[PDB]
Design an enzyme around this catalytic site. Structure first.
Site, PDB file in Angstrom:
ATOM      1  N   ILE A   9       0.776  -1.150  -0.147  1.00 16.54           N
ATOM      2  CA  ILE A   9       0.016   0.145  -0.128  1.00 16.54           C
ATOM      3  C   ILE A   9       1.073   1.250   0.118  1.00 16.54           C
ATOM      4  CG2 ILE A   9      -1.996  -0.885   0.702  1.00 16.54           C
ATOM      5  CD1 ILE A   9      -1.047  -0.516   3.820  1.00 16.54           C
ATOM      6  N   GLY A  10       1.817   1.487  -0.345  1.00 20.54           N
ATOM      7  CA  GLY A  10       2.968   2.081  -0.081  1.00 20.54           C
ATOM      8  C   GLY A  10       4.422   2.280   0.042  1.00 20.54           C
ATOM      9  N   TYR A  14       9.478   5.101   6.743  1.00 21.51           N
ATOM     10  CA  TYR A  14      10.769   4.100   7.210  1.00 21.51           C
ATOM     11  C   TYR A  14      11.245   2.704   6.486  1.00 21.51           C
ATOM     12  CZ  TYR A  14      12.148   7.996  11.161  1.00 21.51           C
ATOM     13  OH  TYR A  14      12.365   8.775  11.800  1.00 21.51           O
ATOM     14  N   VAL A  16       8.173  -0.222   4.325  1.00 26.96           N
ATOM     15  CA  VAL A  16       7.604  -0.756   3.039  1.00 26.96           C
ATOM     16  C   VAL A  16       6.356  -0.768   3.916  1.00 26.96           C
ATOM     17  CG1 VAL A  16       8.595  -2.068   2.754  1.00 26.96           C
ATOM     18  CG2 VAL A  16       7.440  -1.366   1.409  1.00 26.96           C
ATOM     19  N   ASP A  73      -6.231   7.886   3.188  1.00 27.38           N
ATOM     20  CA  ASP A  73      -5.686   8.712   3.930  1.00 27.38           C
ATOM     21  C   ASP A  73      -5.896  10.260   4.059  1.00 27.38           C
ATOM     22  OD1 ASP A  73      -3.607   9.419   2.027  1.00 27.38           O
ATOM     23  OD2 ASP A  73      -3.019   7.336   1.694  1.00 27.38           O
ATOM     24  N   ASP A 114       6.678  14.534  11.680  1.00 30.99           N
ATOM     25  CA  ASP A 114       6.884  14.061  10.800  1.00 30.99           C
ATOM     26  C   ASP A 114       5.782  14.020   9.673  1.00 30.99           C
ATOM     27  OD1 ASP A 114       8.037  14.554   7.663  1.00 30.99           O
ATOM     28  OD2 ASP A 114       8.331  12.343   7.803  1.00 30.99           O
ATOM     29  N   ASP A 132       2.208   6.784  11.899  1.00 31.59           N
ATOM     30  CA  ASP A 132       3.619   7.573  10.757  1.00 31.59           C
ATOM     31  C   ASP A 132       4.888   7.803  11.447  1.00 31.59           C
ATOM     32  OD1 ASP A 132       5.267   6.347   8.609  1.00 31.59           O
ATOM     33  OD2 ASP A 132       5.215   8.253   7.582  1.00 31.59           O
TER      34      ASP A 132
END
Ligand SMILES: CC[C@H](CO)Nc1nc(NCc2ccccc2)c2ncn(C(C)C)c2n1
Ligand SMILES: O=C(O)c1cc([N+](=O)[O-])ccc1NCCc1c[nH]c2ccccc12
EC number: 2.7.11.22
Length: 274
Positions: A9-10, A14, A16, A73, A114, A132
């Site tokens: 999914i991306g 940091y 995969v 997201d 971040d 994340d």
């Protein structure tokens, strides 16, 4: 293998990330593959909050983090809503929820560092969750970086997350990134051209910052009416406090929750196409 990978999914900041199903549980989860820190990361498992993605498991061999799975997201949702805009009551609900998540993690001395729309995850019930986290040590998007980071402050604070969330707030409203720099200095100068070049009057100590140069151009501040036009005065007041240059004057998450902008906050349900 215990996990049947459903779909990559991306790529997170940091490692995969995979959508996966547990073979002997049926549970659908998100798997982040990455690459002392093991101790601190493990603590995050039982600090839970409705507006923080749940960390289910930590596996060491290369490091794996198993998270709860969310279906969309905020960047995807913003993009899907760009012709019409996200309705203000939903912007306000999302901002309120994100400030609750930040107030929780800041009260536990955990920083994100971040924040960006791609790391804000939403579900069909109207919830939004912080994901994340930049907790590894504890092309890259600079658009949400606080000025004290860009100016070389080594010991930046929970204020950096309020700055980032302020930039995201503005972007939900205007449907354009507030400060889309493509280099660290371009990012800094985009901030300066909008908010004015900071000086000792508004940010004491700024001229002592490790990367501050006296040769910085001196731009005048513009007016928030020009910056996020549509937004009402309550919204602009809150945003102005989230984008204060001085990290010590920038509003805290806990204080932002009391801002008059949220007096009529509700919890609408988004229209999600999955
Ligand atoms: C899309 C960028 C984002 C990086 O934070 N990836 C992501 N995306 C998630 N879901 C949104 C998504 C679903 C399906 C395909 C693509 C993205 C997700 N759910 C739990 N997690 C954990 C690892 C925090 C998730 N991470
Ligand atoms: O968000 C990520 O992807 C992430 C990445 C790493 N990492 O890269 O080592 C480590 C942790 C991560 N999330 C933890 C989420 C979390 C659960 N309970 C909490 C309580 C307070 C603050 C945060 C949390």
């Amino acid at each position: 293998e215990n996990f049947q990978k459903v779909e990559k999914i991306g790529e997170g900041t940091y490692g995969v990330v995979y959508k996966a199903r547990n073979k002997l549980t049926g549970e659908v989860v998100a798997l982040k593959k990455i690459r002392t820190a093991i101790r601190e990361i493990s603590l995050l498992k039982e600090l839970n909050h409705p507006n923080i993605v749940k960390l289910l498991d930590v596996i060491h061999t290369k490091l794996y983090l198993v998270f709860e799975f969310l279906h969309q997201d905020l960047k995807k949702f913003m993009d899907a809503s760009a012709l019409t805009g996200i309705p203000l009551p939903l912007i306000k609900s999302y901002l309120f929820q994100l400030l609750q998540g930040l107030a929780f993690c800041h009260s536990h001395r955990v920083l994100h560092r971040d924040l960006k729309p791609q790391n804000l995850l939403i579900n069909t019930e109207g919830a939004i969750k912080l994901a994340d986290f930049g907790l590894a040590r504890a092309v890259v998007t600079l658009w949400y970086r606080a000025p004290e980071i860009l100016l070389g402050c080594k010991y930046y604070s929970t204020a950096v997350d309020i700055w980032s969330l302020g930039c995201i707030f503005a972007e939900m409203v205007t449907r354009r990134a507030l400060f889309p720099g493509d280099s660290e200095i371009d990012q800094l100068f985009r901030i300066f051209r909008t908010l004015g070049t900071p000086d000792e009057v508004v940010w004491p100590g700024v001229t002592s910052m490790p990367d501050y140069k006296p040769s910085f151009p001196k731009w005048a501040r513009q007016d928030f009416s020009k910056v996020v036009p549509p937004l009402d005065e309550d919204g602009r007041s809150l945003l102005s406090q989230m984008l204060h240059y001085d990290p010590n004057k920038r509003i805290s998450a806990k204080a932002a929750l009391a801002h008059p902008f949220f007096q009529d906050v509700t919890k609408p349900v988004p229209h999600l196409r999955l």
